[PDB]
RNA sequence: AAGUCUGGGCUAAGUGGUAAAGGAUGUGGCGCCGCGAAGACAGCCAGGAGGUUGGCUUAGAAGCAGCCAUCCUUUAAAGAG
C-alpha cells in the first residue's frame, strides 16, 4: 500500500539485477524488476548493449508501466570501429575510425530521438561524438 | 591599415617641459631633412599601440605639410615603463629596410599534445619599396611536432620583398610544455 | 536609480505639521515625530510630501533617503500600522498572553515575563504564534527581535522562536 | 637551484643598488612579464621559490623565461664570531634586481592562467611587482 | 569569525562590507564571516 | 550601435513574408512542455514559423516600418507574436488555441491578429478556432 | 570498527545489523610493525586493510609521541612492514646542558663542549636499549 | 614675541603627533575605451531544455574529484558548464 510515482532513472541494456538504483524508488512500487531484462532484451538484442533510458510509473493497485529509448552514440560507433574503450586522451589519439557514411547509417539507428528530422543536423551530433572519444572520420 | 597622427614642431623647449604637459619629444628625418618635433602622449600611444613600426604613421605637420613616416625606435625610460621619445622616418621612393608583421596561420601538432608554439619572431625584416608594405606575412605552423623548429629560408615572401637577415635566421619552435611530473628531480 | 526623489503620498486624513529640525506626522492610529537634517529641505504640498537634497556631495546623496523613507515609513505606520507575527516552534514551548504582558514557556526552569512597551501591543492568538503591531516602525522590527532572542532557533532542530515566515536551514546532529 | 657552474672569484665585493635597469626592461620573450619596482638582491632560492609555484599552477603547458640569474656570492661570517678575521665564507647566491627588470616571462598560457601565476610568483619574491603583457614599445625595442 | 590582515572573499555569496572603521567580509555561510585584525 | 540593423533587418523579414499574423504571450511553461506547443507548431502548418518571439517595441516598432497597420492589440506584458503569416494558419490558430488552454492555467493566451489586411479583435481571435 | 558507533551516529540511530555468517577471504593481508627507535615493538603491532593499513600508519607513530618518555638521544619511532616504512615517529631527546655556564664568550669554547656531546648522542644510541612502561591503553590502542 | 591673515583644493583618521609585506565598497581628482529611446544596471516574474554518463577514469563521477577534449536540432535564449 504505497504511493503513486514518477520515476527518472537511466539504465543499462542487459545488465539487470535487482541491485540499486533499481530499488530505492523502485520498492515504492513493488517493482516487477524482472520485466526489464524480457520485454527489454527482446527488441534492444537488435542494438546490442548500452545505456538505454527509462521512465517507470507506480499506481495504485502497485504496478508499473514505460516506453524506453534508444542506446548512447557512445555505443552504436564503439562497435564499426572495433573499440570497447576510447582512446583514454582524445583529439590527438585515434585508435578506430568512421566514414561520412558509416556515420550517416548511425543517425538512422537513432532518428525516431532527438529533435531535428534532417539527416544533416542529426549525424553531426554523432559526428559530434566522434572527437568526443578521439575516433577520426575519413575525409 | 596606415594612420595618422598629429606632429607640432619643437625648437629649444624643454624636453621635461613637453613631458610635464603629456606631450612627447621626438625628431623626424632622413637623407634630406632633420627637424626637431613634438606629438600628443595620449594621440600617438593609441596610434601607436594599433601601428607599431610595421605601417606608416602620416603627420599632420602644424602647416598642412602632411609627412608620411615610419617609427624606427621609441626610447624607453627604463624606470617607470613610460614612452620617452620617438623617432620618425619619412619615406622616399628607395626601398627601406622595415619590419613586416608575421602571421602563423595554422595550429600545429606540437600543441595537439600539449606543447608550446614560441614564436621567435612575430616579424621580420625586408628591403621593400614604401608601395608594398604587405601588412601581414603567413606562415603555415600546422605542420609542426615537438622539437620542430622553422627557419627564415622557409617563408613565402610576396612581391617581393627580399629578406634583409640570413636564411639560416630560426623564427618558430615548438617546445615542451612544463610539467608538474617533471620538477619533482 | 534614486530614492529621495520619490513622491511621499498623504492618504485622507494624515498630517504633517513642520517645526524646527523635526517634522510630525499625524494619523488616525496615531502622532509621530521625525528626525531631519536642517540642511534637507522638507516639501509639504497638495497632499503629497517630497523632499529634497541641497547638492550632489555624498553626505546629501546619502541623507536623502533616509530622511525620504524615514519620514515615509513613519505615514505608511499611521496609516495603516506595522506588525510583525511569530512562530514558536518546538515541542514542549508555548505562549500565551497574560495581562497586558506576553509569557513565554520555552525550555527554562522559569518561564519568561515580557512587558510590551507603549505603543506595542502583544496578540497571541494560538498556543504558537506571537503578533507584535504598533506605528512605531523600528520600535515593533526591535521588539519582535527581543522575543526571539528569548530562544533563537538550533541549528540541529527545528526548536525555538522564529520571525514570521524566515526560513530553516540545519546541519546534521551526527 | 641556480649558481654559476663555475668562477674566477670566489667572493665578491657587495657594492650599492643605485639607479634603474641597464638592461632587460622590456618583455623579450613570453607574452607576460614581471617587473620589479624596488631594488634588491633576490635570492637563488627565491627565484625558484617563484618559479615552482607558477609550474605547479600551470601545472602541465606553457613555457617560463627567467631573466634574472644569480651570479653574485653573498658571503656570511659564522655565528657568534667577531668583528675582523677575514671575509665570510660562500652562503648562496643573489642576482641584483633594480626597478624595471623584467624578471619572469610565461607564454602559452590564457590571460587569466598567467596572471594568476605571475601573481603567486610576486608573493614568493621579497620586493615590489608589476605584471605586464607583450606591449608593442617592447617589439620596437 | 576569522581575523586577519588579508581579508578577502571566498566564494561569491561573501560580501564585503566596512563598518566602524574595520574591513568586514560577511557571508550566508559564517565559515567565511570575517574581521581584518 | 548595435541593432535595427542586427535582427531588425530579421523581425519584418519573417513577420511580412504575407498578411495574415498574430500575438500570443508565449514564456509560462517549462522549456520542454515550451518545446511542444511550439515544436508542435509545425505539425499544423508549413515550414516553422510558431511564434516569432521577440521584443515588443522591436516587433511594435517593427510594426511602423513595415508598415502593417500597428499590430496595437497587446504589446505590453509577454511578447512573442504567432508569425501565422509564414506558415498556414487559419483555424490552424485553433491548433494552437486548445494547446495552451487545455494545458496549465491559461499556457499562452493571444493578443493581436490582422484579418489579411485588417485588425482582427481580441474577443474575436479567440473564437476563431472553436 | 566501522560499524557500530557509527553504525548508528550514520543513520541515526534506526537499522540494524547482524552477522552470523563466516565466509574467508583470499584478498590482501598486509600487517604493520610499529618500531619505536628501531627497537621493534611487538604489542603495539596491528593488522589491518592494504589502503586502510596505510591510512592508519600516520595516526600511530604520532600518536605516539606524548607516549615515550625521553632517553638521552634523538629517539625514533618509526611504523612499517616487512622493511619498507608506512610511517614516521622521532622524538626529541635533547639531554642538553652543558653550555650553560659559558658567558665570555669565545665562539669556540661554546662549540668544545658539544663535541663531546655529539660524540655521546652518539655512543648512547648503539648500545640504546629503550623501554615504555605501559601507557599502551594509549599507544596503538587507537 | 608676532596673522585666530588672504584666496583655491584635500583630510574626518586627533591621520597630522613613530613601521613593513599584504588587505580593503574610505574619500577625491584628471585621461581613455564600454552597455544604454534593439530601452541599459539593480532587484522581481518567466525559462535556464536536448544526442549526453562526452569518451578515459573508477568503487560512484551522470555540467560540477581528477586526466582528455568542447559538438548540434529547440530557438527568445541555455557553457560537453
Ligand atoms: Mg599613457
Ligand atoms: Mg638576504
Ligand atoms: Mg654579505
Ligand atoms: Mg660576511
Ligand atoms: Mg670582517
Ligand atoms: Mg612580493
Ligand atoms: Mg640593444
Ligand atoms: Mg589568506
Ligand atoms: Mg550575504
Ligand atoms: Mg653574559
Ligand atoms: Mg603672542
Ligand atoms: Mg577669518
Ligand atoms: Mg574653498
Ligand atoms: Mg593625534
Ligand atoms: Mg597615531
Ligand atoms: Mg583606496
Ligand atoms: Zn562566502
Given at each position: 500500500?504505497?504511493?503513486?510515482?514518477?520515476?527518472?532513472?537511466?539504465?543499462?541494456?542487459?545488465?539487470?539485477?535487482?541491485?540499486?538504483?533499481?530499488?530505492?524508488?523502485?520498492?515504492?512500487?513493488?517493482?516487477?524488476?524482472?520485466?526489464?531484462?524480457?520485454?527489454?532484451?527482446?527488441?534492444?538484442?537488435?542494438?546490442?548493449?548500452?545505456?538505454?533510458?527509462?521512465?517507470?510509473?507506480?499506481?495504485?493497485?502497485?504496478?508499473?508501466?514505460?516506453?524506453?529509448?534508444?542506446?548512447?552514440?557512445?555505443?552504436?560507433?564503439?562497435?564499426?570501429?572495433?573499440?570497447?574503450?576510447?582512446?583514454?586522451?582524445?583529439?590527438?589519439?585515434?585508435?578506430?575510425?568512421?566514414?561520412?557514411?558509416?556515420?550517416?547509417?548511425?543517425?538512422?539507428?537513432?532518428?525516431?530521438?532527438?529533435?531535428?528530422?534532417?539527416?544533416?543536423?542529426?549525424?553531426?551530433?554523432?559526428?559530434?561524438?566522434?572527437?568526443?572519444?578521439?575516433?577520426?572520420?575519413?575525409? | 591599415?596606415?594612420?595618422?597622427?598629429?606632429?607640432?614642431?619643437?625648437?629649444?623647449?624643454?624636453?621635461?617641459?613637453?613631458?610635464?604637459?603629456?606631450?612627447?619629444?621626438?625628431?623626424?628625418?632622413?637623407?634630406?631633412?632633420?627637424?626637431?618635433?613634438?606629438?600628443?602622449?595620449?594621440?600617438?600611444?593609441?596610434?601607436?599601440?594599433?601601428?607599431?613600426?610595421?605601417?606608416?604613421?602620416?603627420?599632420?605637420?602644424?602647416?598642412?605639410?602632411?609627412?608620411?613616416?615610419?617609427?624606427?625606435?621609441?626610447?624607453?625610460?627604463?624606470?617607470?615603463?613610460?614612452?620617452?621619445?620617438?623617432?620618425?622616418?619619412?619615406?622616399?621612393?628607395?626601398?627601406?629596410?622595415?619590419?613586416?608583421?608575421?602571421?602563423?596561420?595554422?595550429?600545429?601538432?606540437?600543441?595537439?599534445?600539449?606543447?608550446?608554439?614560441?614564436?621567435?619572431?612575430?616579424?621580420?625584416?625586408?628591403?621593400?619599396?614604401?608601395?608594398?608594405?604587405?601588412?601581414?606575412?603567413?606562415?603555415?605552423?600546422?605542420?609542426?611536432?615537438?622539437?620542430?623548429?622553422?627557419?627564415?629560408?622557409?617563408?613565402?615572401?610576396?612581391?617581393?620583398?627580399?629578406?634583409?637577415?640570413?636564411?639560416?635566421?630560426?623564427?618558430?619552435?615548438?617546445?615542451?610544455?612544463?610539467?608538474?611530473?617533471?620538477?619533482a628531480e | 536609480?534614486?530614492?529621495?526623489?520619490?513622491?511621499?503620498?498623504?492618504?485622507?486624513?494624515?498630517?504633517?505639521?513642520?517645526?524646527?529640525?523635526?517634522?510630525?506626522?499625524?494619523?488616525?492610529?496615531?502622532?509621530?515625530?521625525?528626525?531631519?537634517?536642517?540642511?534637507?529641505?522638507?516639501?509639504?504640498?497638495?497632499?503629497?510630501?517630497?523632499?529634497?537634497?541641497?547638492?550632489?556631495?555624498?553626505?546629501?546623496?546619502?541623507?536623502?533617503?533616509?530622511?525620504?523613507?524615514?519620514?515615509?515609513?513613519?505615514?505608511?505606520?499611521?496609516?495603516?500600522?506595522?506588525?510583525?507575527?511569530?512562530?514558536?516552534?518546538?515541542?514542549?514551548?508555548?505562549?500565551?498572553?497574560?495581562?497586558?504582558?506576553?509569557?513565554?514557556?520555552?525550555?527554562?526552569?522559569?518561564?519568561?515575563?515580557?512587558?510590551?512597551?507603549?505603543?506595542?501591543?502583544?496578540?497571541?492568538?494560538?498556543?504558537?504564534?506571537?503578533?507584535?503591531?504598533?506605528?512605531?516602525?523600528?520600535?515593533?522590527?526591535?521588539?519582535?527581535?527581543?522575543?526571539?532572542?528569548?530562544?533563537?532557533?538550533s541549528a540541529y532542530h527545528?526548536?525555538?522562536?522564529?520571525?514570521?515566515?524566515?526560513?530553516?536551514?540545519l546541519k546534521p546532529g551526527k | 637551484?641556480?649558481?654559476?657552474?663555475?668562477?674566477?672569484?670566489?667572493?665578491?665585493?657587495?657594492?650599492?643598488?643605485?639607479?634603474?635597469?641597464?638592461?632587460?626592461?622590456?618583455?623579450?620573450?613570453?607574452?607576460?612579464?614581471?617587473?620589479?619596482?624596488?631594488?634588491?638582491?633576490?635570492?637563488?632560492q627565491?627565484?625558484?621559490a617563484?618559479?615552482v609555484?607558477?609550474?605547479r599552477?600551470?601545472?602541465?603547458?606553457?613555457?617560463?623565461?627567467?631573466?634574472?640569474?644569480?651570479?653574485?656570492?653573498?658571503?656570511?661570517?659564522?655565528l657568534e664570531?667577531?668583528?675582523?678575521?677575514?671575509?665570510?665564507?660562500?652562503?648562496?647566491?643573489?642576482?641584483?634586481?633594480?626597478?624595471?627588470?623584467?624578471?619572469?616571462?610565461?607564454?602559452?598560457?590564457?590571460?587569466?592562467?598567467?596572471?594568476?601565476?605571475?601573481?603567486?610568483?610576486?608573493?614568493?619574491?621579497?620586493?615590489?611587482?608589476?605584471?605586464?603583457?607583450?606591449?608593442?614599445?617592447?617589439?620596437?625595442? | 569569525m576569522k581575523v586577519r590582515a588579508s581579508?578577502?572573499?571566498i566564494?561569491?555569496?561573501?560580501?564585503?562590507?566596512?563598518?566602524?572603521?574595520?574591513?568586514?567580509?560577511?557571508?550566508?555561510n559564517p565559515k567565511h564571516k570575517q574581521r581584518?585584525g | 550601435?548595435?541593432?535595427?540593423?542586427?535582427?531588425?533587418?530579421?523581425?519584418?523579414?519573417?513577420?511580412?513574408?504575407?498578411?495574415?499574423?498574430?500575438?500570443?504571450?508565449?514564456?509560462?511553461?517549462?522549456?520542454?512542455?515550451?518545446?511542444?506547443?511550439?515544436?508542435?507548431?509545425?505539425?499544423?502548418?508549413?515550414?516553422?514559423?510558431?511564434?516569432?518571439?521577440?521584443?515588443?517595441?522591436?516587433?511594435?516598432?517593427?510594426?511602423?516600418?513595415?508598415?502593417?497597420?500597428?499590430?496595437?492589440?497587446?504589446?505590453?506584458?509577454?511578447?512573442?507574436?504567432?508569425?501565422?503569416?509564414?506558415?498556414?494558419?487559419?483555424?490552424?490558430?485553433?491548433?494552437?488555441?486548445?494547446?495552451?488552454?487545455?494545458?496549465?492555467?491559461?499556457?499562452?493566451?493571444?493578443?493581436?491578429?490582422?484579418?489579411?489586411?485588417?485588425?482582427?479583435?481580441?474577443?474575436?481571435?479567440?473564437?476563431?478556432?472553436? | 570498527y566501522d560499524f557500530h558507533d557509527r553504525l548508528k551516529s550514520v543513520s541515526r540511530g534506526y537499522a540494524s545489523m547482524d552477522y552470523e555468517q563466516a565466509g574467508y577471504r583470499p584478498g590482501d593481508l598486509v600487517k604493520v610493525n610499529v618500531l619505536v627507535h628501531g627497537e621493534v615493538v611487538d604489542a603495539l603491532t596491528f593488522i589491518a586493510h592494504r589502503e586502510k593499513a596505510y591510512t592508519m600508519a600516520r595516526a600511530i607513530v604520532d600518536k605516539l609521541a606524548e607516549v615515550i618518555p625521553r632517553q638521552l638521544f634523538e629517539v625514533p619511532i618509526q611504523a612499517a612492514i616487512g622493511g619498507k616504512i608506512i610511517a614516521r615517529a622521532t622524538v626529541k631527546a635533547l639531554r642538553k646542558d652543558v653550555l650553560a655556564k659559558c658567558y665570555?664568550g669565545?665562539v669556540?669554547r661554546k662549540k668544545k663542549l658539544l663535541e663531546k656531546q655529539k660524540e655521546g648522542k652518539k655512543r648512547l644510541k648503539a648500545i640504546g636499549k629503550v623501554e615504555v612502561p605501559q601507557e599502551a591503553f594509549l599507544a596503538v590502542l587507537s
Amino acid at each position: 500500500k504505497k504511493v503513486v510515482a514518477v520515476v527518472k532513472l537511466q539504465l543499462p541494456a542487459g545488465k539487470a539485477t535487482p541491485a540499486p538504483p533499481v530499488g530505492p524508488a523502485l520498492g515504492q512500487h513493488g517493482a516487477n524488476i524482472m520485466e526489464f531484462v524480457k520485454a527489454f532484451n527482446a527488441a534492444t538484442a537488435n542494438m546490442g548493449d548500452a545505456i538505454v533510458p527509462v521512465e517507470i510509473t507506480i499506481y495504485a493497485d502497485r504496478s508499473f508501466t514505460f516506453v524506453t529509448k534508444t542506446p548512447p552514440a557512445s555505443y552504436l560507433i564503439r562497435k564499426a570501429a572495433g573499440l570497447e574503450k576510447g582512446a583514454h586522451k582524445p583529439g590527438r589519439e585515434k585508435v578506430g575510425r568512421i566514414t561520412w557514411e558509416q556515420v550517416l547509417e548511425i543517425a538512422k539507428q537513432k532518428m525516431p530521438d532527438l529533435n531535428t528530422t534532417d539527416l544533416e543536423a542529426a549525424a553531426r551530433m554523432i559526428a559530434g561524438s566522434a572527437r568526443s572519444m578521439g575516433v577520426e572520420v575519413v575525409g | 591599415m596606415e594612420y595618422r597622427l598629429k606632429a607640432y614642431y619643437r625648437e629649444g623647449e624643454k624636453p621635461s617641459a613637453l613631458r610635464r604637459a603629456g606631450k612627447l619629444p621626438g625628431v623626424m628625418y632622413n637623407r634630406h631633412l632633420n627637424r626637431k618635433v613634438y606629438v600628443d602622449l595620449v594621440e600617438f600611444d593609441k596610434v601607436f599601440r594599433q601601428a607599431s613600426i610595421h605601417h606608416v604613421i602620416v603627420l599632420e605637420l602644424p602647416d598642412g605639410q602632411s609627412l608620411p613616416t615610419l617609427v624606427r625606435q621609441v626610447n624607453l625610460d627604463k624606470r617607470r615603463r613610460r614612452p620617452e621619445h620617438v623617432d620618425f622616418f619619412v619615406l622616399s621612393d628607395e626601398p627601406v629596410e622595415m619590419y613586416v608583421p608575421l602571421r602563423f596561420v595554422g595550429t600545429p601538432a606540437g600543441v595537439r599534445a600539449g606543447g608550446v608554439l614560441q614564436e621567435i619572431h612575430r616579424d621580420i625584416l625586408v628591403k621593400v619599396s614604401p608601395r608594398n608594405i604587405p601588412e601581414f606575412i603567413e606562415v603555415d605552423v600546422s605542420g609542426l611536432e615537438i622539437g620542430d623548429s622553422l627557419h627564415a629560408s622557409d617563408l613565402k615572401l610576396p612581391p617581393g620583398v627580399e629578406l634583409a637577415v640570413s636564411p639560416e635566421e630560426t623564427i618558430a619552435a615548438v617546445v615542451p610544455p612544463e610539467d608538474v611530473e617533471k620538477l619533482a628531480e | 536609480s534614486r530614492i529621495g526623489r520619490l513622491p511621499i503620498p498623504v492618504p485622507k486624513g494624515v498630517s504633517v505639521e513642520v517645526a524646527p529640525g523635526r517634522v510630525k506626522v499625524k494619523g488616525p492610529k496615531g502622532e509621530l515625530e521625525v528626525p531631519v537634517s536642517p540642511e534637507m529641505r522638507v516639501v509639504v504640498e497638495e497632499g503629497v510630501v517630497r523632499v529634497e537634497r541641497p547638492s550632489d556631495e555624498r553626505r546629501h546623496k546619502s541623507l536623502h533617503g533616509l530622511t525620504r523613507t524615514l519620514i515615509a515609513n513613519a505615514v505608511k505606520g499611521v496609516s495603516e500600522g506595522y506588525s510583525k507575527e511569530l512562530l514558536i516552534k518546538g515541542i514542549g514551548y508555548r505562549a500565551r498572553l497574560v495581562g497586558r504582558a506576553l509569557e513565554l514557556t520555552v525550555g527554562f526552569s522559569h518561564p519568561v515575563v515580557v512587558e510590551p512597551p507603549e505603543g506595542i501591543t502583544f496578540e497571541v492568538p494560538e498556543p504558537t504564534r506571537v503578533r507584535v503591531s504598533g506605528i512605531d516602525k523600528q520600535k515593533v522590527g526591535q521588539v519582535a527581535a527581543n522575543i526571539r532572542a528569548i530562544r533563537k532557533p538550533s541549528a540541529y532542530h527545528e526548536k525555538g522562536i522564529y520571525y514570521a515566515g524566515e526560513p530553516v536551514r540545519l546541519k546534521p546532529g551526527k | 637551484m641556480l649558481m654559476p657552474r663555475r668562477m674566477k672569484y670566489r667572493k665578491q665585493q657587495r657594492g650599492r643598488l643605485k639607479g634603474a635597469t641597464k638592461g632587460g626592461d622590456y618583455v623579450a620573450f613570453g607574452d607576460y612579464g614581471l617587473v620589479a619596482l624596488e631594488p634588491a638582491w633576490i635570492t637563488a632560492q627565491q627565484i625558484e621559490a617563484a618559479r615552482v609555484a607558477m609550474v605547479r599552477h600551470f601545472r602541465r603547458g606553457g613555457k617560463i623565461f627567467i631573466r634574472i640569474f644569480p651570479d653574485k656570492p653573498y658571503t656570511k661570517k659564522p655565528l657568534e664570531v667577531r668583528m675582523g678575521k677575514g671575509k665570510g665564507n660562500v652562503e648562496g647566491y643573489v642576482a641584483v634586481v633594480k626597478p624595471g627588470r623584467v624578471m619572469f616571462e610565461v607564454a602559452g598560457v590564457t590571460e587569466e592562467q598567467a596572471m594568476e601565476a605571475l601573481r603567486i610568483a610576486g608573493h614568493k619574491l621579497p620586493i615590489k611587482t608589476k605584471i605586464v603583457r607583450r606591449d608593442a614599445y617592447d617589439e620596437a625595442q | 569569525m576569522k581575523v586577519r590582515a588579508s581579508v578577502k572573499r571566498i566564494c561569491d555569496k561573501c560580501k564585503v562590507i566596512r563598518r566602524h572603521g574595520r574591513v568586514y567580509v560577511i557571508c550566508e555561510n559564517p565559515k567565511h564571516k570575517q574581521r581584518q585584525g | 550601435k548595435r541593432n535595427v540593423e542586427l535582427l531588425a533587418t530579421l523581425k519584418e523579414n519573417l513577420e511580412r513574408a504575407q498578411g495574415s499574423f498574430f500575438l500570443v504571450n508565449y514564456q509560462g511553461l517549462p522549456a520542454k512542455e515550451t518545446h511542444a506547443l511550439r515544436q508542435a507548431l509545425k505539425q499544423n502548418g508549413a515550414r516553422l514559423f510558431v511564434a516569432k518571439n521577440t521584443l515588443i517595441r522591436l516587433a511594435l516598432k517593427e510594426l511602423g516600418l513595415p508598415e502593417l497597420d500597428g499590430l496595437q492589440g497587446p504589446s505590453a506584458v509577454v511578447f512573442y507574436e504567432d508569425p501565422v503569416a509564414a506558415a498556414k494558419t487559419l483555424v490552424q490558430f485553433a491548433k494552437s488555441n486548445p494547446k495552451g488552454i487545455p494545458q496549465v492555467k491559461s499556457g499562452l493566451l493571444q493578443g493581436q491578429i490582422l484579418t489579411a489586411k485588417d485588425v482582427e479583435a481580441l474577443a474575436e481571435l479567440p473564437t476563431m478556432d472553436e | 570498527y566501522d560499524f557500530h558507533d557509527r553504525l548508528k551516529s550514520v543513520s541515526r540511530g534506526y537499522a540494524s545489523m547482524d552477522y552470523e555468517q563466516a565466509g574467508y577471504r583470499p584478498g590482501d593481508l598486509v600487517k604493520v610493525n610499529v618500531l619505536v627507535h628501531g627497537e621493534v615493538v611487538d604489542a603495539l603491532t596491528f593488522i589491518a586493510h592494504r589502503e586502510k593499513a596505510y591510512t592508519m600508519a600516520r595516526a600511530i607513530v604520532d600518536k605516539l609521541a606524548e607516549v615515550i618518555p625521553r632517553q638521552l638521544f634523538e629517539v625514533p619511532i618509526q611504523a612499517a612492514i616487512g622493511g619498507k616504512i608506512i610511517a614516521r615517529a622521532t622524538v626529541k631527546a635533547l639531554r642538553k646542558d652543558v653550555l650553560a655556564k659559558c658567558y665570555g664568550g669565545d665562539v669556540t669554547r661554546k662549540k668544545k663542549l658539544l663535541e663531546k656531546q655529539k660524540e655521546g648522542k652518539k655512543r648512547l644510541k648503539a648500545i640504546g636499549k629503550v623501554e615504555v612502561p605501559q601507557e599502551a591503553f594509549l599507544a596503538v590502542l587507537s
